[PDB]
Design a protein around this ligand. Structure first.
Ligand SMILES: COC(=O)c1cccc(NS(C)(=O)=O)c1
Ligand SMILES: [Cl-]
Ligand SMILES: [Cl-]
Ligand SMILES: [Cl-]
Ligand SMILES: [Cl-]
Length: 211
């Protein structure tokens, strides 16, 4: 059947939609379709064509109030790639508190992690019951499931600036150094390539956590 209303969604509302590039963009909800128990949402993008999307691939174009977000909530957040900025999907790993200077910790679908403000988050409309089950990468999905279900029990390695450790990249161990610590994240310098990365202190990519 063709619907005009579905929960709090209404045909003609302005919305964010996931494109095939895995980045999220502004559009208009032009139709809602049902086929038995399933539902699909037709979006017309501003500078693109149309897509018929599932409910976990559309997001509201407003920032959620803090009482609606939990550890494990499915969101779209501002993602830094070189000097460009995109909207990319992720999972909330921490909500605002004193030890993280009132920010949200995001674990992105591709394995990266970052702290963001409430004004840099958008909630996904119809998340799955087990929110992590639509993460394509198997190693990311299994780590996030264990993290969300075990929370607040969070094993992490205590690290200080200048400390030498081994860090994983493309299947092998690399000599590396701790440059900086910011709450639950650590900035690691890869010594041969002389380039840095922000990594979660409980990640198995850090050798002390792997063992
Ligand atoms: C490709 O990413 C992975 O395999 C992977 C595995 C484990 C952890 C992570 N990152 S996180 C959730 O610790 O910020 C990524
Ligand atoms: Cl295809
Ligand atoms: Cl039907
Ligand atoms: Cl879809
Ligand atoms: Cl579900």
């Amino acid at each position: 059947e063709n619907l005009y209303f579905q929960g709090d969604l209404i045909v003609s509302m302005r919305i964010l939609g996931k494109k095939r590039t895995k980045t999220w963009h502004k559009g208009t909800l032009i139709a809602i379709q049902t086929v038995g128990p399933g539902k699909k949402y037709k979006v017309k993008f501003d500078n693109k064509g149309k897509s018929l999307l599932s409910g976990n691939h559309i997001a509201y174009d407003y920032h959620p109030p803090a009482d609606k977000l939990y550890v494990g909530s499915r969101v779209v957040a501002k993602y830094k790639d070189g000097n460009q900025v995109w909207l990319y999907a992720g999972i909330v790993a921490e909500t605002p508190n004193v030890k993280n200077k009132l920010r949200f910790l995001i674990f992105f679908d591709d394995g990266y992690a970052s702290y963001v403000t409430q004004s840099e988050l958008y909630p996904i409309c119809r998340p799955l019951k087990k929110t992590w089950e639509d993460i394509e990468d198997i190693s990311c999905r299994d780590f996030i499931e264990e993290y969300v279900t075990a929370y607040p029990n969070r094993p992490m390695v205590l690290l200080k600036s200048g400390q030498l450790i081994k860090t994983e990249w493309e299947g092998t161990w690399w000599k590396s150094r701790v440059e900086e610590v910011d709450g639950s994240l650590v900035r690691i310098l890869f010594l041969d390539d002389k380039r840095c990365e922000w990594i979660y202190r409980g990640s198995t990519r850090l050798e002390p956590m792997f063992s």
